[PDB]
Design a protein around this motif. Structure first.
Motif, PDB file in Angstrom:
ATOM      1  N   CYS D  32       0.847  -1.184   0.000  1.00 39.70           N
ATOM      2  CA  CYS D  32       0.000   0.000   0.000  1.00 39.70           C
ATOM      3  C   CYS D  32       0.886   1.238   0.000  1.00 39.70           C
ATOM      4  CB  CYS D  32      -0.907   0.004   1.219  1.00 39.70           C
ATOM      5  SG  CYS D  32      -1.673   1.605   1.555  1.00 39.70           S
ATOM      6  N   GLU D  34      -0.020   4.291   0.350  1.00 39.81           N
ATOM      7  CA  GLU D  34      -0.517   5.272   1.308  1.00 39.81           C
ATOM      8  C   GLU D  34      -0.029   4.964   2.718  1.00 39.81           C
ATOM      9  OE1 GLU D  34      -2.032   3.714  -0.936  1.00 39.81           O
ATOM     10  OE2 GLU D  34      -3.026   5.135  -2.281  1.00 39.81           O
ATOM     11  N   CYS D  35      -0.212   3.722   3.170  1.00 43.29           N
ATOM     12  CA  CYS D  35       0.203   3.320   4.507  1.00 43.29           C
ATOM     13  C   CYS D  35       1.531   2.577   4.528  1.00 43.29           C
ATOM     14  CB  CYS D  35      -0.872   2.438   5.151  1.00 43.29           C
ATOM     15  SG  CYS D  35      -1.424   1.062   4.124  1.00 43.29           S
ATOM     16  N   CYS D  45      -6.280  -1.108   0.733  1.00 41.39           N
ATOM     17  CA  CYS D  45      -5.505  -0.920   1.950  1.00 41.39           C
ATOM     18  C   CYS D  45      -6.429  -0.855   3.161  1.00 41.39           C
ATOM     19  CB  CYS D  45      -4.672   0.360   1.848  1.00 41.39           C
ATOM     20  SG  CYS D  45      -3.707   0.777   3.324  1.00 41.39           S
ATOM     21  N   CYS D  48      -5.052   2.709   6.132  1.00 44.91           N
ATOM     22  CA  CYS D  48      -5.692   3.982   5.825  1.00 44.91           C
ATOM     23  C   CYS D  48      -7.209   3.874   5.917  1.00 44.91           C
ATOM     24  CB  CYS D  48      -5.278   4.457   4.433  1.00 44.91           C
ATOM     25  SG  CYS D  48      -3.502   4.709   4.235  1.00 44.91           S
TER      26      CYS D  48
HETATM   27 ZN   LIG Z   1      -2.519   2.853   3.274  1.00 43.76          ZN
END
Ligand SMILES: [Zn+2]
Lengths: 264, 217, 149, 108, 115
Positions: D32, D34-35, D45, D48
């Motif tokens: 992921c 984002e995270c 994900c 997040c």
């Molecule tokens: Zn994430």
């Protein structure tokens, strides 16, 4: 991790490039098909005359559906619709290298997408210069009737009034069955549409709609030699000796727009 | 704008090209043979060539009870009582052996299917074969017959009382008590009136067909 | 044996499926974002899209009022559909509902989870996937091909 | 009917150690961005999503208090505003939800 | 479709058929390779405690397109010599019997009404 990962054609393609890719594939397919339109202008192999015992190549068609047909005698006959799509010769096998009795020719139709196909299949088609085809089938063709690979085949090869044999995979019924190749013999041809390459075949054809089928001359003893009065190797639109009508009808068939049949 | 039922294709995986080719042939035949507009419940006289007879045509008059089929294979059935015998004949619209089609009386009935008329009294189904055509107005809606037929004893071909049939032309009250209707209503399946999975939208298809039919004319 | 089937078998019967679908539709309208099993979410996605069309048809429509009343158990939602959902989607011609896959529930049954939401809502945006940029080497190579063409 | 004889461990061992019965490895694992946590290619994900789902409850909790009763769904459009954000003219005639927290970076 | 049983109406002026009887005449077989009896198929009808051959002229089973579907099962009695038992037929008889394979000229001549 230094390990194998799953990938697809669209994984790394951006939206802007993805639209370009779709257009490019259509352009590539069109260019390849146009290049192969003229077989007679592509160093065609020598043409031989017809003699008894010759066998012509067959075609692969898609099962469009069925519709009712009326004859000049007032009888109603249900007929099935078969469409020949992108029928081209792919690989010729010599008589000795395949079977001493007769030589064989490979014909494929119904072009398919290149995104989800093996590289080996694409590599073979790249050499042939044609887009990949859904199904490969082998036809027994005599040496005199052999045709060079890459020659386009059209529904006009067969003619109205000719009996034909169609073989296709039977519909699978699941665990109880089916999904086995079967052949239907003695189906007459009523009409052929040149514009859409549609052949009208008497009777029913095994398999589901939109399913590819194999079309070849009838093998019954009665119709031993029917190709004498038909295009012996095949029908060549490239020659264009005489432009054929868009729709071909059998004599008994009652054409639409004809006067109402009166049983006088 | 009256769009005949046969032109509307049925849903499926069949190629639309077949319908386009079929419609072209249908339109060409329509020029040779004129197909008048009619609805279930209308009395029609249809001229057809006789195969058994030589150079002699046949005319059969009956009330239209059912319309079925699509494309060139569309057929319509008209019912009548001849010599006291109820007879139903199915005529294929585009059969070359149908010489002419005459709408003796253009009208509509309460229900789109009149198979219950078999269970109704004979008079509702009796029609004079020689009855002359009645006046009709082209730029108007076909007359709608709202008369409710009377049924014969309870044993019927089909359970018309059931809500699924939803027959609006049967005098159920005379032959069925309100309690009996409630028993029939046990098969209401009320969600069916609200079910969107059994609905097929042909508005765009119907509109497109109209221009194509007129263009051929 | 599920060849040619166009309807899922949910609940204890066809009526339960409608009621279960009715409950899901009512909840989705109230909240505009609901998490449910993927199989059920896929079945109800078509119903939600058609409902927006009924709202677009107009408040005065008798069929829409009957349809809205039946599908929405909570009657406060009936004004909302004609005055909130329908105005919002007037520009849109379709695709009113967005359905995405969610990680399976860790509830010992490992059911497939998905989230269905109405587009244009005021809720926080879902973590949607973002396509690769054209600045990537492969895209840049394709860009050179495009310029040549 | 009962087994005619005891099944040998060697015979049993082969059955359970047959490749068909062994646990297969998965190659669809993804990260992921984002995270920075793991995910599947066809799965979203979760680290997040935990923020998103909890934020939804916080937003929903504010909505529930504002309504104050059941069957109070407004017939007008709704909007969410965070501290430091002021309603605009376009926001007129819409239910406004006020959040004490500042506008989240992810939320736009 | 005159299958087994299939209560039938004797459309004839024969003494056995003409005379009313408390038990309906029944058809529990057909003079054909198949067991189903349709128009133009010979049968044997038990009438007035006697057995007489009869020819089917109508049936209530749905028929093919372009044909009339009758609402009652009608039959005509035929003697052993081949001549019809009755000298007249009352109910309309389809004219397809003429072209149907078999000997139908005698019966058709006795048919007053044709549909
Ligand atoms: Zn994430």
């Amino acid at each position: 991790l230094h390990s194998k990962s799953s990938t697809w054609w669209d994984e790394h393609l951006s939206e802007e490039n993805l639209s370009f890719v779709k257009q490019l594939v259509s352009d590539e397919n069109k260019t390849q098909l146009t290049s192969k339109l003229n077989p007679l202008k592509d160093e065609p192999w020598p043409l031989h005359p017809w003699e008894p015992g010759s066998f012509r190549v067959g075609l692969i068609a898609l099962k469009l559906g069925m519709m009712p047909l009326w004859t000049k005698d007032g009888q109603k006959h249900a007929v099935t619709l078969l469409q020949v799509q992108d029928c081209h010769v792919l690989k010729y096998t010599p008589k000795e290298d395949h079977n001493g009795k007769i030589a064989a020719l490979t014909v494929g139709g119904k072009t398919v997408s290149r995104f989800y196909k093996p590289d080996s299949r694409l590599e073979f088609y790249r050499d042939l210069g044609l887009p990949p085809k859904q199904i490969h089938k082998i036809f027994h063709v005599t040496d005199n009737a052999v045709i060079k690979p890459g020659t386009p085949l059209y529904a006009a090869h067969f003619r109205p009034g000719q009996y034909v044999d169609v073989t296709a995979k039977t519909i699978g019924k699941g665990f109880q069955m089916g999904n086995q190749n079967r052949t239907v013999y003695g189906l007459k041809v009523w009409r052929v549409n040149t514009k859409h390459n549609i052949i009208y075949v008497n009777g029913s054809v095994p398999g589901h709609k939109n399913c590819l089928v194999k079309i070849k001359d009838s093998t019954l003893p009665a119709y031993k030699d029917s190709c004498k009065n038909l295009p012996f190797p095949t029908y060549f639109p490239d020659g264009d000796e005489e432009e054929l009508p868009e729709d071909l009808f059998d004599e008994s068939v009652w054409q639409p727009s004809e006067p109402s049949i009166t049983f006088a | 704008r009256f769009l005949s039922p046969e032109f509307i294709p049925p849903r499926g995986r069949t190629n639309p090209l077949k319908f386009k080719i079929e419609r072209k042939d249908m339109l060409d035949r329509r020029k040779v043979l004129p197909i008048p507009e009619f609805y279930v419940g209308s009395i029609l006289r249809v001229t057809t060539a006789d195969p058994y007879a030589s150079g002699k045509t046949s005319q059969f008059l009956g009330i239209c009870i059912k319309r079925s089929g699509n494309g060139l294979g569309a057929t319509f059935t008209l019912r009548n009582t001849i010599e006291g015998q109820g007879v139903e004949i199915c005529f294929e619209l585009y059969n070359p052996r149908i010489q002419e089609i005459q709408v003796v009386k253009l009208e509509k009935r309460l229900d789109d299917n009149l198979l219950y008329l078999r269970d109704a009294l004979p008079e509702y189904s009796t029609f004079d074969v020689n009855m002359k055509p009645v006046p009709q107005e082209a730029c108007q809606e076909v007359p709608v017959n709202k008369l409710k037929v009377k049924m014969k004893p309870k044993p019927w071909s089909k359970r018309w009382e059931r809500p699924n049939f939803n027959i609006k032309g049967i005098r159920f009250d005379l032959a069925l008590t309100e309690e009996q209707m409630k028993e029939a209503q046990k098969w209401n399946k009320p969600w069916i009136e609200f079910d969107m999975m059994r609905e097929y939208d042909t508005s765009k298809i119907e509109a497109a067909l109209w221009e194509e039919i007129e263009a051929s004319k | 044996i599920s060849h040619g089937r166009v309807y899922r078998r949910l609940g204890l019967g066809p009526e339960s499926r409608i009621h279960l679908l009715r409950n899901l539709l009512t909840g989705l309208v109230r909240h505009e974002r609901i998490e449910a099993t993927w199989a059920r979410a896929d079945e109800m996605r078509g119903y939600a899209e058609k409902l927006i069309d009924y709202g677009k048809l107009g408040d005065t429509n008798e069929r829409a009022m009957r349809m809205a009343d039946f599908w929405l158990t909570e009657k406060d939602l009936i004004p909302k559909l004609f005055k909130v959902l329908a105005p919002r989607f007037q520009g849109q011609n379709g695709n009113y509902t967005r359905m995405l896959q969610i990680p399976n529930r860790k509830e010992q049954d490992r059911a497939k989870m998905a989230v269905i939401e109405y587009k244009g809502n005021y809720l926080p945006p879902l973590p949607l996937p973002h396509r690769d940029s054209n600045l990537t080497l492969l895209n840049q190579l394709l860009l050179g091909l495009q310029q040549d063409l | 009917a009962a087994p005619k004889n005891r099944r040998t461990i060697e015979v049993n061992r082969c059955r359970r150690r047959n490749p068909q019965k062994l646990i297969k490895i998965k190659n669809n694992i993804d990260i992921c961005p984002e995270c920075g946590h793991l995910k599947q290619k066809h799965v979203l994900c979760g680290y997040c999503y935990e923020k998103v789902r909890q934020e939804t409850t916080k937003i929903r909790q504010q909505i529930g208090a504002q309504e104050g009763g059941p069957f109070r769904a407004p017939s007008v459009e709704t909007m969410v505003l965070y501290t430091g954000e002021k309603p605009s003219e376009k926001d007129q005639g819409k239910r406004i939800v006020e959040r004490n927290i500042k506008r989240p970076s992810w939320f736009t | 479709a005159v299958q087994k049983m299939t209560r039938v109406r004797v459309v004839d002026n024969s003494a056995l058929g003409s005379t009313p009887y408390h038990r309906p005449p029944r058809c529990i077989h057909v003079y054909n390779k198949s067991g189903v009896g349709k128009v133009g198929d010979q049968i044997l009808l038990a009438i007035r405690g006697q057995k007489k051959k009869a020819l089917i002229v109508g049936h209530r089973m749905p028929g093919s397109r372009m044909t009339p579907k009758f609402d009652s099962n009608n039959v005509v009695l035929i003697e052993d010599n081949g001549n019809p038992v009755g000298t007249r037929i009352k109910i309309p008889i389809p004219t397809s019997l003429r072209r149907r394979e078999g000997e139908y000229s005698k019966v058709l001549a006795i048919a007053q009404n044709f549909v």
